[PDB]
Design a protein around this ligand. Structure first.
Ligand SMILES: CSCC[C@H](NC=O)C(=O)O
Ligand SMILES: [K+]
Ligand SMILES: [K+]
Ligand SMILES: [Mg+2]
Ligand SMILES: [Mg+2]
Ligand SMILES: [Mg+2]
Ligand SMILES: [Mg+2]
Ligand SMILES: [Mg+2]
Ligand SMILES: [Mg+2]
Ligand SMILES: [Mg+2]
Ligand SMILES: [Mg+2]
Ligand SMILES: [Mg+2]
Ligand SMILES: [Mg+2]
Ligand SMILES: [Mg+2]
Ligand SMILES: [Mg+2]
Ligand SMILES: [Mg+2]
Ligand SMILES: [Mg+2]
Ligand SMILES: [Mg+2]
Ligand SMILES: [Mg+2]
Ligand SMILES: [Mg+2]
Ligand SMILES: [Mg+2]
Ligand SMILES: [Mg+2]
Ligand SMILES: [Mg+2]
Ligand SMILES: [Mg+2]
Ligand SMILES: [Mg+2]
Ligand SMILES: [Mg+2]
Ligand SMILES: [Mg+2]
Ligand SMILES: [Mg+2]
Ligand SMILES: [Mg+2]
Ligand SMILES: [Mg+2]
Ligand SMILES: [Mg+2]
Ligand SMILES: [Mg+2]
Ligand SMILES: [Mg+2]
Ligand SMILES: [Mg+2]
Ligand SMILES: [Mg+2]
Ligand SMILES: [Mg+2]
Ligand SMILES: [Mg+2]
Ligand SMILES: [Mg+2]
Ligand SMILES: [Mg+2]
Ligand SMILES: [Mg+2]
Ligand SMILES: [Mg+2]
Ligand SMILES: [Mg+2]
Ligand SMILES: [Mg+2]
Ligand SMILES: [Mg+2]
Ligand SMILES: [Mg+2]
Ligand SMILES: [Mg+2]
Ligand SMILES: [Mg+2]
Ligand SMILES: [Mg+2]
Ligand SMILES: [Mg+2]
Ligand SMILES: [Mg+2]
Ligand SMILES: [Mg+2]
Ligand SMILES: [Mg+2]
Ligand SMILES: [Mg+2]
Ligand SMILES: [Mg+2]
Ligand SMILES: [Mg+2]
Ligand SMILES: [Mg+2]
Ligand SMILES: [Mg+2]
Ligand SMILES: [Mg+2]
Ligand SMILES: [Mg+2]
Ligand SMILES: [Mg+2]
Ligand SMILES: [Mg+2]
Ligand SMILES: [Mg+2]
Ligand SMILES: [Mg+2]
Ligand SMILES: [Mg+2]
Ligand SMILES: [Mg+2]
Ligand SMILES: [Mg+2]
Ligand SMILES: [Mg+2]
Ligand SMILES: [Mg+2]
Ligand SMILES: [Mg+2]
Ligand SMILES: [Mg+2]
Ligand SMILES: [Mg+2]
Ligand SMILES: [Mg+2]
Ligand SMILES: [Mg+2]
Ligand SMILES: [Mg+2]
Ligand SMILES: [Mg+2]
Ligand SMILES: [Mg+2]
Ligand SMILES: [Mg+2]
Ligand SMILES: [Mg+2]
Ligand SMILES: [Mg+2]
Ligand SMILES: [Mg+2]
Ligand SMILES: [Mg+2]
Ligand SMILES: [Mg+2]
Ligand SMILES: [Mg+2]
Ligand SMILES: [Mg+2]
Ligand SMILES: [Mg+2]
Ligand SMILES: [Mg+2]
Ligand SMILES: [Mg+2]
Ligand SMILES: [Mg+2]
Ligand SMILES: [Mg+2]
Ligand SMILES: [Mg+2]
Ligand SMILES: [Mg+2]
Ligand SMILES: [Mg+2]
Ligand SMILES: [Mg+2]
Ligand SMILES: [Mg+2]
Ligand SMILES: [Mg+2]
Ligand SMILES: [Mg+2]
Ligand SMILES: [Mg+2]
Ligand SMILES: [Mg+2]
Ligand SMILES: [Mg+2]
Ligand SMILES: [Mg+2]
Ligand SMILES: [Mg+2]
Ligand SMILES: [Mg+2]
Ligand SMILES: [Mg+2]
Ligand SMILES: [Mg+2]
Ligand SMILES: [Mg+2]
Ligand SMILES: [Mg+2]
Ligand SMILES: [Mg+2]
Ligand SMILES: [Mg+2]
Ligand SMILES: [Mg+2]
Ligand SMILES: [Mg+2]
Ligand SMILES: [Mg+2]
Ligand SMILES: [Mg+2]
Ligand SMILES: [Mg+2]
Ligand SMILES: [Mg+2]
Ligand SMILES: [Mg+2]
Ligand SMILES: [Mg+2]
Ligand SMILES: [Mg+2]
Ligand SMILES: [Mg+2]
Ligand SMILES: [Mg+2]
Ligand SMILES: [Mg+2]
Ligand SMILES: [Mg+2]
Ligand SMILES: [Mg+2]
Ligand SMILES: [Mg+2]
Ligand SMILES: [Mg+2]
Ligand SMILES: [Mg+2]
Ligand SMILES: [Mg+2]
Ligand SMILES: [Mg+2]
Ligand SMILES: [Mg+2]
Ligand SMILES: [Mg+2]
Ligand SMILES: [Mg+2]
Ligand SMILES: [Mg+2]
Ligand SMILES: [Mg+2]
Ligand SMILES: [Mg+2]
Ligand SMILES: [Mg+2]
Ligand SMILES: [Mg+2]
Ligand SMILES: [Mg+2]
Lengths: 55, 122, 114, 208, 119
RNA sequence: CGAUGUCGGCUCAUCACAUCCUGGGGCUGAAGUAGGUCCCAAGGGUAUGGCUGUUCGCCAUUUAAAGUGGUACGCGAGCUGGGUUUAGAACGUCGUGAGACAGUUCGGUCCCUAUCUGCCGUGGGCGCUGGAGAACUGAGGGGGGCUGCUCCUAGUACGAGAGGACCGGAGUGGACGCAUCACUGGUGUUCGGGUUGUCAUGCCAAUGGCACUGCCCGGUAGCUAAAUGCGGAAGAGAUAAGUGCUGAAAGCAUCUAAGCACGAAACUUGCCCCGAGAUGAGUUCUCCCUGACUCCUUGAGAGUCCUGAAGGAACGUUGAAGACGACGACGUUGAUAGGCCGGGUGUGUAAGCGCAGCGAUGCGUUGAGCUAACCGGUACUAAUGAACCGUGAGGCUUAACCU
RNA sequence: AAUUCCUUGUCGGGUAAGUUCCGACCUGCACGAAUGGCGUAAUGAUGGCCAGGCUGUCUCCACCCGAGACUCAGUGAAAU
RNA sequence: ACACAGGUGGUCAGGUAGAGAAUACCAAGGCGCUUGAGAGAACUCGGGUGAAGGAACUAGGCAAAAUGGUGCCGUAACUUC
RNA sequence: AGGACCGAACCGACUAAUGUCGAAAAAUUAGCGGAUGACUUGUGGCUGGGGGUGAAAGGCCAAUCAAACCGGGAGAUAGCU
């Protein structure tokens, strides 16, 4: 319960260091269409591993 | 698995009908007694004529337990009534000349050989 | 697994009589009194059976002199000599633990005769 | 010396007289000696052993080479055992379970079953506070954790909540029942650490 | 701690959990394709595939089981008539899971679940 | 005094030694059994109940023992609120009275999501000087250390008798701890069955919903204790009190001043765990990398193209791993999960049809059907070709020797 | 004794054991007769005590089902 | 003070079970309560079950558990009958 | 017949837990008492500050009571911080 006296810009920085969320840096390329997507996910148009499996 | 405040039907014909356990002997902080362990008994309900009158502190031996007794072969004997035989404090050996109901093998240990001779089964 | 099943199936005796619950069964048992090797009997109703191969067991209830005495035998132990069935009863439950509460007239059970 | 072996559950043995003894079944395949560490090179005499089997692809070149030095198949994992001065072993030598045919009591060492984040009641056998009788939001909590302004702190090695299990433990002087040569088994009495499939460093009992 | 312990809870009380799968089976069997969350879809394999296998042996009691589960005559009619004979050679794995990004409103990993046919 | 919450109980402890037990000793008004007091010894252990708000105390029954203290008369941002100190009310007493009394009596809101230190866990970062994967060593740190009863020696020594050992050896208990699920049980709203009320699937039959899982009865896997295993060590070294052995100063005597030997649960090891961030960043093994060029404050200089391996990450399938990270297994050259198949287990003779009976209901096909987490097989489904990170022989000064 | 300080008075009952309770004794510190005294059936969310039944209150905790806690996305305080 | 688990007078009164405007399940009709999605640690909250014992808990059986309907047989001290 | 009995609506508030920067400046959940009367409730009246009202607690009189609230004397007075 409650702080004795306030932390600093520094400490508040030190804490936030780990909040930096990682990028993907791992985009797939669908074999037929050549579109980029998340690994093991379908493409936005509607492909997965060079086969249409969605309307 | 008899312990402090446990009420027991009495196996012998001494006089007591219901007997309450007040303490488990043989080691400090000891929780329970079973099989053929010694307990300290007070008598909460006696018959009129009997050898042992009501409210008498004396020792006893557990003979039957509802939780029961294990044997070497991974096999158990459960009863349907916790019970004991009364004893004479410092003297030992039972009061009652006849014993009702069965008793276990593991009670067989020299000092209680009197109980097994007088008992009907096991 | 095969490693356990090799060890279990070895030790199990290949001559058990197939009994059901609610059957009145005399079970002959070995007892040792130092150098002696006595055969006790123990007649009673089979309240429950447990099948697990080598670890199988069954509970027998008897109401001998005075009070009830529920005994649990490990079926494939050497201590159990023979399991002789007498009457076989028509009950329609696996476990008959309701026989703990009942005694005398309520405790008795119908025979199969199938 | 000692042998690495996978745990394969528990069963029991009915001894001919009567007694049913509970036994852990430890499969102990041929422990192949990879590397003989010596006082000349390392500064201590010992042997490095392995067992089981990896796939020729899941294994990494660093270890695929390491085995090729010895001239054996790539066993899954690696362990190291201390020699007893007078003993001496060779590289690329199989050790069967027949070491334990002589000895009676053994130590089994394996990783215990992980319970995760256990409370003080479970982990340290702390007594639970009164389940009723006015109690407010504090049944299974640890109570006090120190004194007052004297130490003004919590002492080190305080019994608090945290991780329980998933840690290496030894159970000592377990009696061996049977030592099977044909199927490479070892039947120790009682229960040993770790779940079925966990590895066990079995070795002769130190407390002679 | 859930060692060896199967079955997703999905933040729902049992009686509810058992219903939503009963709905989702009826949803999947009729349309032959669904978008739902990746866990829901993974747990949905354990409800729908049994009903497909039960439908192979075209008998009365099997209709009465396929009606004890599911609770719809329509779905029962689409089973046994179509999905009974259509899945005969195929011995298991009647449904297919395909991840389709994230549900915009709450960043939940969506997934297409559909029967292995589409023809 | 711009608040440091006051007794007692619970939980959790920790230290001291002025030691209650256990251990080692001297003297004894010590025959032995048991004591008495004193010395050394803090490793471990050190009741449950009745009465009272109690601390304490008394009592009952145990125990090897039921130690004395410190720690804000330890511990209320950990719990309680019986007591003492708010407002109500009464008795006794005091007061003309309002009211008053460590006099008694009945009733009387206990707030706080943790910034920092600390502590228990658990990661990320960089470092450890070419990079990577392993396996160790062990500085150091922690855990553990309790003990009864029963026999054997032996009814032996001792003792006129009664009673009755030391020193060693074996078995079996209690308490505490560690592990584990084979057994014994618990649990098991995810398995099977019975059944009450009522709605629904057109209705009969059969199912399902809802009533705390509607109520119940059994129960697989898991977890688990009351269940079953194992543990405290023996041994060495250096010691305390104490016991000694030779031996002057003091032609003797003395355990000591030189010298030499025993001597306890304490101390240091032995047993177990963490452990090289042990920056003093240790070792052994294996793996991986050997191409040009101008510019020049010719500097462990910086770039240009060519090259990016070992390995790793991520993503996926996931786990007896797990809050999240992490940790382990598996990714088609594949049993990692799901399914399916065959068991196993569990529940107890499904459904429909036929016969019996007026009907409820019974009987036959029938130990049937249905069976979650279980075991063994089987690629049917899902674990993707690749992209991403990670480079191109490793500074100097000395030293020991092959060209 | 809703009154008693000395006090846990003494004796009896109840309990293995009862500073509470019930009965009695009078030594009423400091009851007492409409600021009423002593009885009193019925009544009390009333005070004290005991006995049955029943129980996770406890020995001694175990497992399970839901809501939070924990991770992801969106919003976003407070005392200090 | 809020789209705030609270306060607010009168009227209408379906079905099956039921003594009933209690309760359960439904009708007519109206809603699913304006953050979700995962995981399935400690701990907290509301619950379920529990071997053996059964108040040993505690200031105190507080809290839980238990009893529970209808018809009939029977029902003590004491009593102001 | 009844300030009778059990028991919903309605009225109350005995115990416990929850909540205690709450859902809420007094509530929720599970039980609890009264429930044809000294009952309860709507609408509208009357009683006003040393005054009211009070089956009496110094209770209540607009979240305020051993003397309300608003404005004024008024910049009260303060040997005190
Ligand atoms: C209302 S009287 C308060 C009495 C006081 N209590 C706490 O400090 C004492 O000291
Ligand atoms: K049938
Ligand atoms: K003035
Ligand atoms: Mg400050
Ligand atoms: Mg500051
Ligand atoms: Mg900082
Ligand atoms: Mg785990
Ligand atoms: Mg406790
Ligand atoms: Mg309270
Ligand atoms: Mg609570
Ligand atoms: Mg809390
Ligand atoms: Mg708290
Ligand atoms: Mg699984
Ligand atoms: Mg949620
Ligand atoms: Mg329901
Ligand atoms: Mg079928
Ligand atoms: Mg089939
Ligand atoms: Mg069904
Ligand atoms: Mg201050
Ligand atoms: Mg205190
Ligand atoms: Mg001393
Ligand atoms: Mg030591
Ligand atoms: Mg005491
Ligand atoms: Mg303080
Ligand atoms: Mg002091
Ligand atoms: Mg204090
Ligand atoms: Mg305190
Ligand atoms: Mg504090
Ligand atoms: Mg109080
Ligand atoms: Mg109170
Ligand atoms: Mg009080
Ligand atoms: Mg008081
Ligand atoms: Mg009260
Ligand atoms: Mg608090
Ligand atoms: Mg140490
Ligand atoms: Mg000892
Ligand atoms: Mg069971
Ligand atoms: Mg159950
Ligand atoms: Mg079911
Ligand atoms: Mg099912
Ligand atoms: Mg039945
Ligand atoms: Mg109907
Ligand atoms: Mg209809
Ligand atoms: Mg009908
Ligand atoms: Mg409905
Ligand atoms: Mg409902
Ligand atoms: Mg309801
Ligand atoms: Mg309910
Ligand atoms: Mg409900
Ligand atoms: Mg209930
Ligand atoms: Mg139920
Ligand atoms: Mg169900
Ligand atoms: Mg049902
Ligand atoms: Mg009922
Ligand atoms: Mg009920
Ligand atoms: Mg001399
Ligand atoms: Mg010792
Ligand atoms: Mg599979
Ligand atoms: Mg077969
Ligand atoms: Mg078969
Ligand atoms: Mg079977
Ligand atoms: Mg039939
Ligand atoms: Mg059925
Ligand atoms: Mg039929
Ligand atoms: Mg039939
Ligand atoms: Mg299945
Ligand atoms: Mg199923
Ligand atoms: Mg399976
Ligand atoms: Mg398998
Ligand atoms: Mg008495
Ligand atoms: Mg007395
Ligand atoms: Mg009196
Ligand atoms: Mg008197
Ligand atoms: Mg006189
Ligand atoms: Mg007078
Ligand atoms: Mg008076
Ligand atoms: Mg009076
Ligand atoms: Mg007068
Ligand atoms: Mg007067
Ligand atoms: Mg007068
Ligand atoms: Mg009077
Ligand atoms: Mg009077
Ligand atoms: Mg009177
Ligand atoms: Mg009276
Ligand atoms: Mg009277
Ligand atoms: Mg009253
Ligand atoms: Mg009192
Ligand atoms: Mg009492
Ligand atoms: Mg009682
Ligand atoms: Mg957030
Ligand atoms: Mg602010
Ligand atoms: Mg809203
Ligand atoms: Mg609301
Ligand atoms: Mg209808
Ligand atoms: Mg109605
Ligand atoms: Mg209603
Ligand atoms: Mg309708
Ligand atoms: Mg309609
Ligand atoms: Mg409608
Ligand atoms: Mg509306
Ligand atoms: Mg509305
Ligand atoms: Mg809402
Ligand atoms: Mg939970
Ligand atoms: Mg709970
Ligand atoms: Mg319950
Ligand atoms: Mg039940
Ligand atoms: Mg129960
Ligand atoms: Mg119980
Ligand atoms: Mg049961
Ligand atoms: Mg029971
Ligand atoms: Mg008590
Ligand atoms: Mg107590
Ligand atoms: Mg009270
Ligand atoms: Mg109560
Ligand atoms: Mg309960
Ligand atoms: Mg119960
Ligand atoms: Mg209840
Ligand atoms: Mg119940
Ligand atoms: Mg009748
Ligand atoms: Mg009335
Ligand atoms: Mg009621
Ligand atoms: Mg009122
Ligand atoms: Mg809260
Ligand atoms: Mg109710
Ligand atoms: Mg009411
Ligand atoms: Mg009532
Ligand atoms: Mg009344
Ligand atoms: Mg009015
Ligand atoms: Mg007017
Ligand atoms: Mg009034
Ligand atoms: Mg007053
Ligand atoms: Mg006031
Ligand atoms: Mg005034
Ligand atoms: Mg004023
Ligand atoms: Mg002023
Ligand atoms: Mg003034």
């Amino acid at each position: 319960a409650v702080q004795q006296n306030k932390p600093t810009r520094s400490k508040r920085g030190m804490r936030r260091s780990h909040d930096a969320l990682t990028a993907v840096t791992s985009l797939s390329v669908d074999k037929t269409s050549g579109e980029k997507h998340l690994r093991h996910h379908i493409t936005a148009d509607g492909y997965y591993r060079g086969r249409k499996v969605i309307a | 698995m008899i312990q402090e405040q446990t009420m027991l039907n009495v196996a012998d014909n001494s006089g007591a009908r219901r007997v309450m356990c007040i303490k488990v002997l043989g080691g400090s902080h000891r929780r329970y007694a079973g099989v053929g362990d010694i307990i300290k008994i007070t008598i909460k309900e006696a018959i009129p004529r009997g050898k042992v009158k009501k409210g008498d502190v004396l020792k006893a031996v557990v003979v039957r337990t509802k939780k029961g007794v294990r044997r070497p072969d991974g096999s158990v004997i459960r009863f349907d009534g916790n019970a004991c035989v009364l004893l004479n404090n410092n003297s030992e050996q039972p009061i009652g000349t006849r014993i009702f109901g069965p008793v276990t093998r593991e009670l067989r240990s020299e000092k209680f050989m009197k109980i097994i001779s007088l008992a009907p089964e096991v | 697994s095969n490693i356990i099943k090799q060890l279990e199936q070895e030790q199990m005796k290949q001559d058990v009589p197939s009994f059901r619950p609610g059957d009145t069964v005399e079970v002959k048992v070995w007892v040792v009194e130092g150098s002696k090797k006595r055969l006790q009997a123990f007649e009673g109703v089979v309240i429950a059976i447990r099948n697990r191969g080598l670890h199988s067991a069954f509970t027998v209830r008897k109401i001998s002199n005075g009070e009830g005495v529920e005994r649990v035998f490990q079926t494939h132990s050497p201590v159990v000599d023979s399991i002789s069935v007498k009457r076989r009863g028509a009950v329609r439950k696996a476990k008959l633990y309701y026989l703990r509460e009942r005694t005398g007239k309520a405790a008795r059970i119908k025979e199969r005769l199938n | 010396i000692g042998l690495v072996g996978k745990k394969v559950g528990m069963t029991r043995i009915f001894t001919e007289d009567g007694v049913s003894i509970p036994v852990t079944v430890i499969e102990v395949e041929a422990n192949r000696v990879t590397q003989v560490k010596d006082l000349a090179n390392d500064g201590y005499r010992a042997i490095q052993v392995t067992t089981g089997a990896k796939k020729a692809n899941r294994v990494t070149k660093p270890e695929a080479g390491h085995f090729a030095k010895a001239g054996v198949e790539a066993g899954r994992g690696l362990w190291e055992f201390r020699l007893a001065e007078g003993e001496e072993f060779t590289v690329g030598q199989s050790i069967s379970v027949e070491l334990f045919a002589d000895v009676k009591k053994v130590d089994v060492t394996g990783t215990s079953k992980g319970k995760g984040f256990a409370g003080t009641v479970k982990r340290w056998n702390f007594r639970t506070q009164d389940a009723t009788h006015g109690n407010s939001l504090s049944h299974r909590v640890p109570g006090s954790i120190g004194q007052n302004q004297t130490p003004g702190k919590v002492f080190k090695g305080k019994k608090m909540a945290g991780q329980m299990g998933n840690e290496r433990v030894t159970v000592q002087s377990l009696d061996v029942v049977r030592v099977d040569a044909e199927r490479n088994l070892l039947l120790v009495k009682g229960a040993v650490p770790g779940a079925t499939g966990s590895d066990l460093i079995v070795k002769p009992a130190v407390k002679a | 701690m859930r060692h060896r312990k199967s079955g997703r809870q999905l933040n729902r009380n049992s009686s509810h959990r058992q219903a939503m799968f009963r709905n989702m089976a009826g949803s999947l069997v009729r349309h032959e394709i669904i978008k739902t969350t990746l866990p829901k879809a993974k747990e949905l394999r354990r409800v729908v595939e049994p009903l497909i296998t039960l439908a192979k042996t075209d008998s009365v009691a099997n209709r009465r089981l396929a009606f004890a589960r599911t609770r719809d005559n329509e779905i029962v009619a689409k089973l046994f008539n179509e999905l009974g004979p259509r899945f005969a050679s195929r011995a298991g794995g009647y449904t297919r899971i395909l991840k389709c990004g994230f549900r915009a409103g709450d960043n939940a990993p969506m997934a297409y679940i559909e029967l292995v046919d589409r023809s």
